[PDB]
Design a protein around this ligand. Sequence first.
Ligand SMILES: [Mg+2]
Ligand SMILES: [Mg+2]
Length: 99
Amino acid sequence: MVNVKVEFLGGLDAIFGKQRVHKIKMDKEDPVTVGDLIDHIVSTMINNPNDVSIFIEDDSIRPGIITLINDTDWELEGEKDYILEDGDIISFTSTLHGG
Ligand SMILES: [Mg+2]
Ligand SMILES: [Mg+2]
């Protein structure tokens, strides 16, 4: 079981009922990855399926969204492969600069 927070920034809150910060309890036994977290967000937290394409394209984070893991570019942590620890904070920012 792992507890993390996710932040939906650069306007992404619009697909999450205008709520920017979400507390997430991942019930899965360790290890739980950022890939698992994204699956969870898509499966349970996007309340209009028409908005899923705003968050993911071809089952990957949508081009134009920057993902930071504890204030760090997720590339430096293995991206989807990063293993969540209790208290981690993951933010997603929509921006024209995003990759
Ligand atoms: Mg710091
Ligand atoms: Mg550490």
